Amino acid sequence: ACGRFFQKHQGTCFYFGELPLSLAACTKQWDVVTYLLENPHQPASLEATDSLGNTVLHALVMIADNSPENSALVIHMYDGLLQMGARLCPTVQLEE
Amino acid sequence: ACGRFFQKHQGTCFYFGELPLSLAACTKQWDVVTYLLENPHQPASLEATDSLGNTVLHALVMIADNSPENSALVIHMYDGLLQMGARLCPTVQLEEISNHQGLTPLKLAAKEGKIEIFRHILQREFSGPYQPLSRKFTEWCYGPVRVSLYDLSSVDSWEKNSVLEIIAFHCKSPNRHRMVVLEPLNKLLQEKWDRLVSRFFFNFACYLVYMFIFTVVAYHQPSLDGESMLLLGHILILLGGIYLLLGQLWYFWRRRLFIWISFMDSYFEILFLLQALLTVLSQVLRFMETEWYLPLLVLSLVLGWLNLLYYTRGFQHTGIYSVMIQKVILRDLLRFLLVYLVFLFGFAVALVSLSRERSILDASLELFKFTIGMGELAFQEQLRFRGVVLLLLLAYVLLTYVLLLNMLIALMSETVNHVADNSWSIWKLQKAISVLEMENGYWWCRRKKHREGRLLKVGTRGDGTPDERWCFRVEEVNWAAW
Amino acid sequence: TVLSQVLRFMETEWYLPLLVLSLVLGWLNLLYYTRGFQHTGIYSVMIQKVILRDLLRFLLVYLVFLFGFAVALVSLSRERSILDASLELFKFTIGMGELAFQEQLRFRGVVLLLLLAYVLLTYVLLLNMLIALMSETVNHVADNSWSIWKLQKAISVLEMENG
């Protein structure tokens, strides 16, 4: 889901990762992030690349900033994505 | 109910608004304020004018002050007066009524530097859902992180009496910049300064680049008499003063020759008048015969080259430093010269009197050797009381260092008395003060004036029947629960 | 360094005049390594970096003032070599202003009351930079440039392993 607002251009934007799970990190919910993987009809994946060939974890750091409250919740999501990740894809190394 | 105590005169007073509902705001009760309108026998009105043609809302801001607890309760009353007002008089617009001088209350809130309502008054959260016709001064559409929007009541430069009309010119400023640092007026700096800083540089070019070649006359100048380039200089020496004469004169035509109250930093504006005025001294001698032209046009060239310091402005930050120091040291320069120079009168007399064994102003240069200092110190014994003048001059080595010191440390005290982002913002004031002339154009006669096509995006989103406003779109990034 | 080499046998002549600067800046740039043998450097690059911005802002303000006054000096003293006559004004830069008052110019008070205007503003031109510096240290740095000492070291580590 790429466009003007979804591109990383200066102003009128934020480069969240241009796909459903990518903004699901930015939503700070941690409830649908599990279900959009757990969904039996069509499961998502962190393997899903974007316009710069990234997983969601590259967008987490770009969307991360110098706001302690934002980094605190970002950290909480970030750590648990590896717990949900490594459980469901133990064959794949995730931060490489 | 007007009198001595109820008049706005200095001391023994407070100008609450001279009628029952006016002090009812100052009573901080909010219970009788409803009933004195709800009373069925004789209802009051905010329409009730006073000695300066004001509603109660003009008195709220005058009675408001730099007390947070007072402004907090003042804000609470102030917002609900519009809820009780607009309900009972929806036909009447409430914050657009002018005083006897012709001034609105939201504009008049800037006049006296009201701190702590004034930020609130711009930034208000109560129209949707319960007064959708009031319009907030705020709006929002399309947020994952909020794309905000602020309206425009009168604060944009060109609308005939904004706060930009008074905060630039008629500012009675306890200190300004903060009132300007709030987001809708603060952000407005760059929205047009993008379009104006290039034209500022284009006009700054025309200020300084012709002052450069104004000098090369004096380079080629003869004392007594393709060489027409030297003679051509005179035609631009005419323009050297005459351009900056009219230009700075018609500034006072629109400033009506306003009184010395704006002494703060309008001395920089009249530093152009110095060059403008002093250029003519040579012109109207110079053909005629009178002779004092080359001697005194020195100062016309001097102060002109000096006043090119003024524009140490916005091409880099530094200026946040420039005017911070330059303004406060103009007070120090006054205090410096008043103390120092008057010491050495009687000692130049003591020098010439002891050295006996109208031209003493030139003999005072003997003492001004040590000002830099390069004190001669040359000891001789022809004076026959050798120790008098010798033990005299050693007294000034300590106090001359002290006379630097006390000013060096009077300065230390000015920086020990910390300024966080005060003069850092005065950089933007100096820019936003310099915005005054940008939209108006040039009775300089490049184009005799310039019009206005610099207004902001049409709101066209309000509640029925009047749906229309002028507004501006702002960006934000917030990290709350939602 | 090469400017001298490939003149020097040949004949061209501007070699000893301009190799001065090759020797100068080389000896100057030995300041760079005020680094890690003692701490001090936590000071060195903190000031040296921020004053490179101050040095730019200093020279842009000051030097351009004295052009028209060197013209005012030579113009009033009438009664391409003025760049050398500007040294008369650069006497007061250090300052060791001559101040030598004579009355052959026939409007004695012009140039005499001119030069007294610069004693105050020359101190101000030092002052405002002295205090623009005060502002840079009033704006406290706790262990920022103290750590940039280690950055400058860890930046200098880039070339060590490569050979």
XYZ file of C-alpha atoms in Angstrom:
741
model
C 0.000 0.000 0.000
C 2.375 2.685 -1.337
C 1.707 6.315 -2.324
C 2.504 9.968 -1.551
C 1.668 9.938 2.177
C 3.042 6.380 2.571
C 6.380 7.248 0.843
C 9.273 8.509 3.040
C 9.402 12.006 1.346
C 10.059 15.037 3.600
C 6.812 16.192 5.277
C 3.169 15.044 4.989
C 4.127 11.418 5.773
C 5.482 8.637 7.914
C 7.223 5.544 6.458
C 5.370 2.900 8.496
C 6.098 0.008 6.048
C 3.225 0.230 3.482
C 1.328 -3.002 4.440
C -1.309 -4.149 7.045
C 1.069 -5.630 9.680
C 3.443 -2.637 9.325
C 0.898 -0.073 10.611
C -0.311 -2.705 13.138
C 3.013 -2.043 14.925
C 2.272 1.717 14.846
C -1.272 1.117 16.210
C 0.267 0.163 19.638
C -2.444 -2.506 20.150
C -0.678 -5.904 20.287
C -4.048 -7.678 19.942
C -4.668 -7.649 16.170
C -0.901 -8.091 15.568
C -1.314 -11.644 16.930
C -4.610 -12.333 15.095
C -3.412 -11.109 11.657
C -0.770 -13.879 12.004
C -3.055 -16.397 13.815
C -5.876 -15.977 11.210
C -6.387 -19.440 9.609
C -7.684 -18.242 6.188
C -4.630 -16.211 5.118
C -1.791 -15.710 7.647
C 0.464 -12.650 7.252
C 4.260 -12.681 7.586
C 7.175 -10.570 8.823
C 8.836 -11.903 5.613
C 6.585 -9.424 3.705
C 8.971 -6.970 2.012
C 8.159 -3.336 1.120
C 9.510 -0.553 -1.192
C 12.921 -0.744 0.557
C 12.893 -4.572 1.047
C 12.093 -4.437 4.783
C 10.364 -6.562 7.395
C 8.170 -4.696 9.939
C 11.173 -4.399 12.324
C 12.947 -1.886 10.023
C 9.797 0.263 10.094
C 9.580 0.009 13.919
C 12.981 1.751 14.154
C 12.089 4.391 11.496
C 8.744 5.075 13.243
C 10.632 5.066 16.590
C 11.856 8.482 17.749
C 13.081 10.539 20.778
C 9.766 10.125 22.696
C 10.331 7.908 25.813
C 6.649 6.871 26.105
C 6.653 5.915 22.385
C 9.961 4.006 22.634
C 8.686 2.227 25.784
C 5.582 0.881 23.991
C 7.643 0.332 20.829
C 10.080 -1.772 22.840
C 7.242 -3.825 24.320
C 5.850 -4.659 20.879
C 9.331 -5.148 19.454
C 10.394 -7.810 21.971
C 7.151 -9.805 21.699
C 7.282 -9.861 17.864
C 10.370 -12.094 18.305
C 8.467 -14.331 20.773
C 5.544 -14.684 18.318
C 8.033 -14.766 15.407
C 10.585 -17.366 16.577
C 7.700 -19.597 17.771
C 5.945 -19.544 14.358
C 9.101 -19.323 12.173
C 11.986 -20.922 14.174
C 13.784 -21.821 10.903
C 14.160 -18.124 9.965
C 16.614 -15.775 11.708
C 14.664 -12.520 12.096
C 17.065 -9.580 12.709
C 19.513 -10.411 9.860
C -21.041 53.190 37.399
C -17.997 55.377 36.624
C -15.761 57.424 38.948
C -12.219 57.856 40.308
C -11.658 54.280 41.529
C -13.619 52.840 38.566
C -11.599 54.860 35.973
C -8.417 53.261 34.525
C -6.050 55.965 36.009
C -2.665 54.792 37.372
C -3.047 53.456 40.944
C -6.015 53.252 43.357
C -8.147 51.408 40.761
C -9.016 48.550 38.473
C -10.925 49.024 35.178
C -13.457 46.203 35.639
C -16.034 47.649 33.158
C -18.135 50.062 35.315
C -21.458 48.082 35.348
C -23.072 45.165 37.333
C -22.219 42.277 34.938
C -18.657 43.626 34.467
C -17.652 43.123 38.134
C -19.688 39.863 38.129
C -16.860 38.481 35.945
C -14.306 39.705 38.530
C -16.327 38.107 41.384
C -15.290 34.605 40.084
C -18.734 33.197 41.032
C -20.427 32.064 37.787
C -23.758 31.728 39.632
C -25.125 35.299 39.625
C -23.595 35.855 36.146
C -26.254 33.439 34.823
C -29.101 34.860 36.963
C -28.440 38.545 36.106
C -29.100 37.438 32.486
C -31.833 34.857 33.341
C -33.758 37.370 35.552
C -37.225 37.793 33.933
C -37.935 41.373 35.158
C -34.966 43.122 33.509
C -32.321 40.969 31.753
C -28.783 42.372 31.412
C -26.651 42.170 28.260
C -23.052 41.748 27.101
C -24.100 44.433 24.546
C -23.892 46.947 27.460
C -21.124 49.397 26.503
C -18.937 51.352 28.965
C -16.644 54.460 28.960
C -14.453 52.850 26.250
C -17.364 51.189 24.334
C -16.650 47.659 25.613
C -18.543 44.458 26.324
C -17.549 42.554 29.510
C -15.017 40.481 27.489
C -12.704 43.507 26.990
C -12.694 44.007 30.770
C -11.946 40.290 31.369
C -8.654 40.721 29.465
C -7.789 44.040 31.215
C -8.578 42.484 34.633
C -6.625 39.366 33.526
C -2.933 39.371 34.459
C 0.206 37.177 34.946
C -1.388 35.119 37.786
C -1.968 31.485 36.596
C -4.707 30.765 39.182
C -6.499 33.999 38.142
C -6.144 33.275 34.401
C -7.367 29.688 34.990
C -10.620 30.868 36.629
C -10.816 33.767 34.158
C -10.598 31.279 31.297
C -13.353 29.141 32.813
C -15.728 32.103 33.049
C -14.622 33.416 29.668
C -15.451 30.231 27.739
C -18.867 29.761 29.373
C -19.910 33.389 28.683
C -19.879 32.374 24.984
C -21.996 29.270 25.760
C -24.547 31.396 27.675
C -24.071 34.215 25.125
C -24.418 32.375 21.786
C -27.419 30.452 23.207
C -29.282 33.652 24.216
C -28.002 35.899 21.372
C -27.143 33.594 18.400
C -27.790 36.476 15.949
C -24.919 38.533 17.439
C -21.240 37.691 16.864
C -19.614 38.276 20.264
C -15.811 38.689 19.882
C -15.933 41.215 16.983
C -17.352 44.297 18.818
C -14.955 47.269 18.814
C -14.069 49.715 21.621
C -14.312 53.552 21.255
C -10.849 53.662 19.596
C -12.013 50.927 17.136
C -10.325 47.820 18.582
C -11.641 44.232 19.063
C -11.090 42.195 22.296
C -9.071 39.306 20.763
C -6.838 41.937 19.116
C -6.763 43.999 22.365
C -5.572 40.874 24.242
C -2.233 41.348 22.410
C -2.078 45.115 23.211
C -1.308 44.713 26.949
C 0.734 41.489 26.679
C -1.879 39.431 28.542
C 0.066 36.109 28.969
C -2.109 33.211 30.031
C -5.545 33.762 28.691
C -4.071 34.893 25.397
C -2.493 31.540 24.580
C -5.765 29.911 25.637
C -7.887 32.340 23.627
C -6.225 31.390 20.347
C -6.202 27.711 21.225
C -9.758 26.847 22.251
C -11.570 23.467 22.485
C -15.334 23.963 22.779
C -17.212 24.548 19.459
C -17.931 21.049 18.144
C -20.167 19.550 19.482
C -21.880 22.253 21.670
C -21.148 25.502 19.843
C -20.394 24.397 16.261
C -20.999 28.011 15.044
C -18.135 29.392 17.250
C -15.308 27.712 15.318
C -12.627 27.030 17.949
C -9.737 28.750 16.270
C -8.998 25.050 15.853
C -10.017 22.132 13.607
C -8.871 18.597 12.638
C -9.265 16.191 9.725
C -7.474 12.945 8.667
C -5.257 11.869 11.598
C -3.293 8.800 12.319
C -1.142 11.449 13.819
C -3.162 14.655 13.716
C -3.248 16.900 10.632
C -4.484 19.970 12.540
C -5.937 23.265 11.271
C -6.215 26.778 12.778
C -8.584 29.564 11.662
C -7.949 33.284 11.093
C -10.016 35.879 13.060
C -7.828 38.994 12.558
C -4.177 37.978 13.225
C -2.845 37.817 9.607
C -0.781 40.926 8.710
C -2.884 42.515 5.945
C -6.314 42.482 7.620
C -6.492 46.064 8.475
C -5.846 45.980 12.277
C -4.349 42.611 13.272
C -2.171 41.952 16.317
C 0.665 42.188 13.724
C -0.523 45.814 13.309
C 0.057 46.443 17.072
C 2.636 43.816 18.265
C 5.017 45.243 15.597
C 4.202 48.989 16.073
C 1.947 49.750 19.087
C 3.348 47.065 21.442
C 3.337 48.087 25.120
C 5.492 45.053 25.662
C 6.476 43.768 29.110
C 8.323 41.357 26.980
C 6.773 40.297 23.633
C 8.264 37.210 22.121
C 6.405 34.552 24.035
C 2.988 35.744 22.777
C 4.404 35.084 19.331
C 5.923 31.646 20.259
C 2.471 29.977 20.329
C 1.891 27.555 17.525
C -0.464 29.224 15.009
C 1.232 32.654 15.137
C 4.698 31.072 15.644
C 4.468 28.678 12.652
C 3.161 31.616 10.539
C 6.765 32.982 10.580
C 7.937 30.719 7.747
C 4.766 30.283 5.631
C 5.327 33.698 4.026
C 9.001 34.240 5.091
C 9.795 31.493 2.523
C 8.337 33.878 -0.091
C 9.713 37.025 1.656
C 13.306 36.007 2.661
C 14.313 35.774 -1.027
C 12.803 39.247 -1.599
C 14.428 40.361 1.692
C 17.779 39.198 0.248
C 16.829 40.870 -3.067
C 16.093 44.150 -1.213
C 19.048 43.627 1.193
C 21.175 43.399 -1.959
C 19.756 46.792 -3.033
C 20.499 48.188 0.464
C 24.173 47.042 0.712
C 25.456 46.544 -2.899
C 24.954 50.214 -3.888
C 26.613 51.271 -0.590
C 29.719 49.348 -1.806
C 30.210 51.339 -5.051
C 29.101 54.508 -3.175
C 32.623 54.325 -1.631
C 34.633 54.172 -4.915
C 33.775 57.858 -5.496
C 36.013 58.642 -2.475
C 38.692 56.277 -3.885
C 38.845 58.222 -7.197
C 37.883 61.592 -5.577
C 40.170 64.591 -6.326
C 40.670 67.483 -3.866
C 41.025 70.338 -6.398
C 40.592 70.470 -10.202
C 36.322 56.752 -19.947
C 36.617 59.226 -17.051
C 32.839 59.957 -17.054
C 32.422 56.997 -14.629
C 33.972 59.238 -11.929
C 31.548 62.069 -12.824
C 28.645 59.547 -12.955
C 29.189 58.849 -9.217
C 27.390 62.102 -8.294
C 24.128 60.825 -9.868
C 24.216 57.774 -7.523
C 25.329 59.992 -4.581
C 22.001 61.813 -5.173
C 20.269 58.413 -4.963
C 22.413 57.396 -1.934
C 20.384 59.734 0.297
C 17.247 60.513 -1.754
C 16.297 56.808 -2.117
C 16.667 56.100 1.625
C 15.149 59.543 2.524
C 11.723 59.014 0.940
C 11.691 55.280 1.806
C 12.168 55.852 5.530
C 9.903 58.960 5.436
C 6.800 57.160 4.056
C 7.383 54.481 6.723
C 6.539 57.298 9.181
C 3.609 58.303 6.906
C 2.104 54.837 7.666
C 3.517 54.965 11.245
C 1.927 58.519 11.465
C 5.176 59.658 13.171
C 4.277 57.531 16.217
C 5.698 58.737 19.546
C 9.065 57.634 21.112
C 7.369 54.655 22.960
C 8.847 52.301 20.290
C 12.449 53.362 21.233
C 13.197 49.637 21.953
C 14.529 48.615 18.481
C 13.161 51.354 16.152
C 16.509 53.163 16.574
C 17.721 50.683 13.910
C 14.924 52.003 11.653
C 16.075 55.630 12.216
C 19.749 54.633 11.719
C 18.680 54.581 8.032
C 17.367 58.158 8.532
C 20.901 59.152 9.682
C 22.434 58.085 6.335
C 19.444 59.411 4.380
C 19.537 62.813 6.131
C 23.332 63.257 6.293
C 23.984 62.452 2.578
C 22.443 65.802 1.485
C 25.079 67.984 3.279
C 27.543 67.530 0.392
C 25.050 67.705 -2.500
C 23.887 71.289 -1.997
C 27.171 72.681 -1.094
C 28.975 70.786 -3.748
C 28.327 72.800 -6.982
C 27.517 76.009 -5.185
C 30.372 76.902 -3.076
C 30.039 76.000 0.210
C 33.200 74.239 1.341
C 32.485 71.886 4.288
C 31.401 68.974 2.053
C 34.352 66.519 1.940
C 34.971 67.012 5.713
C 31.411 66.088 6.873
C 30.332 63.594 4.134
C 32.940 61.342 5.818
C 30.326 60.660 8.535
C 27.614 59.997 5.894
C 29.846 57.278 4.412
C 30.955 56.129 7.909
C 27.554 55.542 9.534
C 26.202 54.012 6.290
C 28.985 51.393 6.285
C 28.513 51.031 10.066
C 24.736 50.463 9.726
C 25.357 47.508 7.348
C 25.859 45.584 10.642
C 22.041 45.795 11.140
C 21.283 42.922 8.715
C 23.249 40.275 10.611
C 19.906 38.534 10.518
C 18.551 35.249 9.088
C 20.998 33.742 6.559
C 22.506 31.972 9.550
C 21.143 31.699 13.116
C 23.788 33.765 14.676
C 21.600 36.815 14.988
C 19.918 35.192 17.931
C 23.205 36.434 19.419
C 23.520 39.703 17.455
C 20.559 41.746 18.758
C 20.587 40.060 22.222
C 23.999 41.591 22.932
C 23.725 44.659 20.609
C 20.468 45.833 22.280
C 21.561 45.291 25.903
C 25.075 46.723 25.271
C 23.512 49.936 23.875
C 22.404 50.464 27.497
C 25.920 49.395 28.641
C 27.556 51.737 26.068
C 25.556 54.647 27.513
C 26.499 53.685 31.102
C 30.143 53.076 30.020
C 30.767 56.479 28.396
C 28.952 58.411 31.173
C 31.342 56.932 33.787
C 34.715 56.825 31.974
C 35.328 59.873 29.735
C 34.423 62.463 32.426
C 37.246 61.251 34.760
C 40.150 62.464 32.573
C 39.160 66.194 32.350
C 40.766 67.321 35.629
C 43.795 65.029 35.152
C 44.570 66.570 31.742
C 44.456 69.851 33.705
C 46.688 68.219 36.373
C 49.093 67.086 33.606
C 49.386 70.526 31.963
C 49.402 72.329 35.364
C 52.250 70.263 36.864
C 54.079 70.331 33.478
C 54.031 74.180 33.424
C 57.444 73.845 35.100
C 42.096 75.910 24.753
C 44.736 73.632 23.148
C 44.737 71.394 26.286
C 42.062 69.287 24.496
C 44.956 68.246 22.205
C 47.190 67.892 25.307
C 44.500 65.494 26.649
C 45.742 63.066 23.937
C 48.745 62.554 26.289
C 46.238 60.962 28.703
C 44.380 59.220 25.830
C 47.679 57.430 25.078
C 46.766 55.176 28.063
C 43.118 54.580 26.932
C 44.022 51.819 24.401
C 46.306 51.587 26.424
C 49.793 52.656 25.325
C 50.681 54.965 28.222
C 53.927 56.809 27.460
C 55.108 56.759 31.076
C 58.123 58.869 30.096
C 59.625 60.108 33.370
C 61.621 63.371 33.426
C 62.743 65.662 36.278
C 62.464 69.173 34.725
C 59.108 69.675 36.528
C 60.980 70.028 39.907
C 58.373 68.008 41.860
C 59.052 64.808 39.880
C 57.041 62.534 42.206
C 53.702 64.364 41.805
C 52.876 63.491 38.171
C 54.801 60.165 38.395
C 52.874 58.897 41.461
C 49.680 60.349 39.886
C 49.751 58.216 36.701
C 50.296 54.913 38.599
C 46.868 55.439 40.253
C 45.081 54.817 36.908
C 46.530 51.379 35.973
C 44.319 49.735 38.637
C 41.112 51.772 38.098
C 41.289 51.516 34.270
C 41.277 47.709 34.651
C 38.456 48.152 37.222
C 36.571 50.395 34.737
C 36.774 47.533 32.213
C 36.160 44.911 34.952
C 32.940 46.385 36.438
C 31.484 46.546 32.884
C 32.881 43.070 32.060
C 31.100 41.804 35.225
C 27.963 43.957 34.809
C 27.866 41.942 31.574
C 28.561 38.683 33.499
C 25.525 39.590 35.647
C 23.393 39.996 32.469
C 24.362 36.421 31.372
C 24.357 35.022 34.956
C 20.762 36.201 34.847
C 19.905 33.401 32.468
C 17.879 33.825 29.259
C 16.663 30.404 28.060
C 14.974 31.044 24.696
C 14.054 34.725 25.119
C 16.418 36.438 22.672
C 16.519 33.189 20.653
C 12.844 34.002 19.929
C 13.580 37.776 19.504
C 15.475 36.596 16.381
C 12.037 35.580 15.038
C 10.508 38.826 16.381
C 13.189 40.844 14.524
C 12.265 38.816 11.403
C 8.482 39.081 12.026
C 8.987 42.797 12.823
C 10.826 43.063 9.462
C 7.797 41.332 7.808
C 5.844 44.568 8.391
C 7.040 46.147 5.109
C 7.070 43.049 2.869
C 3.383 42.759 1.865
C 2.775 46.541 1.514
C 5.207 47.028 -1.401
C 7.322 50.013 -2.399
C 6.427 53.725 -2.501
C 10.206 53.730 -3.193
C 8.723 53.699 -6.770
C 9.933 50.399 -8.239
C 6.214 49.656 -8.203
C 4.475 52.446 -6.220
C 2.819 49.831 -3.998
C 2.125 46.080 -3.885
C -1.291 44.455 -3.470
C -2.352 41.457 -1.343
C -2.740 37.898 -2.638
C -1.251 36.416 0.557
C -4.260 35.050 2.453
C -4.759 31.512 3.741
C -6.924 28.501 2.751
C -10.756 28.912 2.765
C -12.332 26.988 5.683
C -15.840 26.518 4.199
C -16.616 23.815 6.825
C -18.663 25.445 9.655
C -22.170 24.842 11.012
C -25.309 26.185 9.293
C -26.192 28.798 8.266
C -22.779 30.617 8.204
C -20.368 27.882 7.008
C -17.417 30.085 5.945
C -13.995 31.089 7.374
C -10.327 31.593 6.423
C -7.981 28.927 7.878
C -4.571 27.188 7.685
C -3.494 23.495 7.843
C -0.835 22.390 10.410
C 1.006 19.064 10.925
C 1.544 17.302 14.291
C 2.894 14.053 15.785
C 1.315 12.962 19.106
C 1.666 9.750 21.156
C -1.257 9.407 23.585
C -3.668 6.438 23.934
C -5.198 7.540 20.601
C 53.975 20.262 -1.244
C 54.165 19.514 -5.013
C 54.163 23.225 -6.091
C 57.908 23.518 -5.388
C 58.986 20.080 -6.666
C 58.048 20.542 -10.320
C 59.121 24.051 -10.596
C 62.265 23.495 -8.676
C 64.692 21.913 -11.234
C 62.848 23.216 -14.249
C 62.660 26.862 -13.997
C 59.692 28.042 -12.760
C 60.404 30.589 -10.045
C 57.467 30.836 -7.586
C 58.657 27.896 -5.444
C 60.276 29.406 -2.308
C 57.463 32.032 -2.060
C 54.526 29.533 -2.008
C 56.157 26.462 -0.336
C 56.088 28.708 2.773
C 52.365 27.853 3.081
C 53.087 24.111 2.575
C 55.454 24.253 5.566
C 53.085 26.608 7.469
C 49.856 24.585 7.312
C 51.793 21.333 7.921
C 53.224 22.718 11.183
C 49.784 24.216 11.939
C 47.998 20.869 11.377
C 50.234 19.191 14.013
C 47.681 20.717 16.454
C 45.196 18.021 15.260
C 46.725 15.251 17.428
C 46.117 16.977 20.762
C 44.322 13.738 21.469
C 44.678 10.889 24.005
C 48.080 11.029 25.755
C 46.333 13.240 28.287
C 42.592 13.949 28.679
C 42.788 17.506 27.679
C 41.436 16.889 24.217
C 38.000 16.595 25.712
C 38.579 20.367 25.665
C 40.504 20.606 22.366
C 37.868 19.582 19.787
C 34.923 20.898 21.894
C 36.231 24.449 21.494
C 38.131 23.970 18.170
C 34.996 22.635 16.388
C 32.534 25.234 17.728
C 35.020 28.131 17.257
C 35.446 27.163 13.570
C 31.823 28.352 13.281
C 32.739 31.403 15.441
C 35.862 32.079 13.304
C 33.659 32.162 10.190
C 31.128 34.493 11.883
C 33.996 36.621 13.322
C 35.809 37.323 10.031
C 32.556 37.947 8.090
C 31.612 40.750 10.536
C 34.963 42.435 11.318
C 37.274 42.698 8.273
C 34.608 44.201 5.948
C 34.145 47.283 8.222
C 37.596 48.813 7.566
C 37.367 49.076 3.716
C 35.527 52.421 3.565
C 37.498 53.854 6.517
C 40.829 53.159 4.780
C 39.227 55.124 1.916
C 38.148 57.782 4.471
C 41.740 57.880 5.820
C 43.389 58.323 2.398
C 40.603 60.684 1.181
C 40.825 63.082 4.152
C 44.662 62.774 4.110
C 44.806 63.909 0.434
C 45.244 67.387 1.946
C 45.651 50.447 -5.783
C 48.359 50.982 -3.115
C 45.653 51.932 -0.538
C 45.633 48.217 0.459
C 49.095 48.981 1.925
C 47.693 52.269 3.329
C 45.029 50.094 5.049
C 47.900 48.896 7.312
C 47.541 52.349 8.973
C 44.103 51.135 10.132
C 45.446 47.611 10.855
C 47.811 49.270 13.367
C 44.738 49.410 15.682
C 43.685 45.742 15.068
C 46.211 44.267 17.577
C 45.746 47.066 18.725
C 48.598 49.584 18.525
C 46.725 52.529 16.997
C 49.188 55.274 16.041
C 46.794 58.092 16.939
C 49.324 60.623 15.634
C 47.433 63.918 15.347
C 48.577 66.547 12.814
C 46.869 69.647 11.362
C 48.134 69.706 7.727
C 44.814 68.152 6.574
C 43.008 71.519 7.247
C 39.887 69.849 8.719
C 41.814 68.348 11.662
C 38.695 67.268 13.595
C 37.278 64.984 10.868
C 39.849 62.150 10.944
C 40.599 62.754 14.671
C 36.939 62.442 15.779
C 36.571 59.540 13.283
C 39.212 57.258 14.870
C 37.808 57.655 18.431
C 34.576 55.972 17.214
C 36.391 52.608 16.824
C 37.851 52.192 20.359
C 34.362 51.325 21.686
C 33.137 49.139 18.780
C 36.438 47.190 18.522
C 35.986 46.192 22.189
C 32.312 45.447 21.351
C 33.444 43.349 18.338
C 35.579 41.292 20.749
C 32.863 41.425 23.462
C 29.915 40.116 21.378
C 32.110 37.146 20.308
C 33.447 36.736 23.880
C 29.783 36.593 25.040
C 28.498 34.561 22.061
C 31.094 32.158 23.481
C 29.750 32.702 27.047
C 26.327 31.708 25.648
C 27.849 28.478 24.211
C 29.180 27.554 27.718
C 26.125 28.995 29.560
C 24.301 26.460 27.422
C 25.741 23.658 29.500
C 27.345 20.501 28.071
C 27.579 17.841 30.808
C 29.505 14.938 29.245
C 28.769 15.580 25.555
C 32.163 16.702 24.235
C 33.806 14.708 27.058
C 32.442 11.671 25.158
C 33.321 13.209 21.718
C 36.933 12.702 22.918
C 36.158 8.958 22.730
C 34.307 9.465 19.415
C 37.386 11.243 17.980
C 39.436 8.240 19.199
C 36.867 5.654 17.982
C 36.594 7.632 14.709
C 40.421 7.407 14.486
C 40.107 3.601 15.047
C 38.662 3.370 11.513
C 42.116 3.086 9.875
C 43.911 0.967 12.503
C 42.741 -2.570 11.605
C 42.827 -2.056 7.795
C 46.609 -1.507 7.591
